């Protein structure tokens, strides 16, 4: 053994508790934490940011808008972070699907006012066009 870092003895329990899928019978394991920490360093993000809940917020915010506009390889790295942050924020989650709902919930709640947008006014796009004929 080499002590812990990302998850302590108590936190470890929560990890083995969370189920990989909503209708499955498998739970998360250390192996899954590694793949995530690695994908980060590689992509460009740190790995020690998975210890603190705050740091995880910076990883979920980036992968958030990338979820829809990101390959599957980016989807797995996101679903994992959502769980890690939940464990640290002290949020009870049955499965991944539940961990995400809780995460996004905390963002949307703020987005409601962050994206209040201006008054009623249609977008007046500028005039532009191309051409290439006789």
Curated annotation (Swiss-Prot):
It comes from the Viruses. It is a lipid-anchor. A motif (Nuclear localization signal) lies at residues 25-31. Coiled coil: none annotated. A motif (Nuclear export signal) lies at residues 15-21. Residues 110-134 are annotated as: Disordered. The modification Phosphotyrosine is found at residue 134. It is found in: Virion membrane; Host nucleus; Host cytoplasm. Homotrimer; further assembles as hexamers of trimers. Interacts with gp41 (via C-terminus). Interacts with host CALM1; this interaction induces a conformational change in the Matrix protein, triggering exposure of the myristate group. Interacts with host AP3D1; this interaction allows the polyprotein trafficking to multivesicular bodies during virus assembly. Part of the pre-integration complex (PIC) which is composed of viral genome, matrix protein, Vpr and integrase. This is Matrix protein p17. It comes from Human immunodeficiency virus type 2 subtype A (isolate ROD) (HIV-2). The chain holds residues 2 to 135 of 1464 of the full protein.
């Amino acid at each position: 053994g080499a002590r812990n870092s990302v998850l302590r003895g108590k936190k470890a329990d929560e990890l083995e508790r969370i189920r990989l899928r909503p209708g499955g019978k498998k739970k998360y394991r250390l192996k899954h934490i590694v793949w995530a920490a690695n994908k980060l360093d590689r992509f460009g993000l740190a790995e020690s940011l998975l210890e603190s809940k705050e740091g995880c917020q910076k990883i979920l915010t980036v992968l958030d808008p990338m979820v829809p506009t990101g390959s599957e390889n980016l989807k797995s790295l996101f679903n994992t972070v959502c769980v890690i942050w939940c464990i640290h924020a002290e949020e009870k989650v049955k499965d991944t699907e539940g961990a995400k709902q809780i995460v996004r919930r905390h963002l949307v709640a703020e987005t409601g006012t962050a994206e209040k947008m201006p008054s009623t006014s249609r977008p007046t796009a500028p005039s532009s066009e191309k051409g290439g004929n006789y």
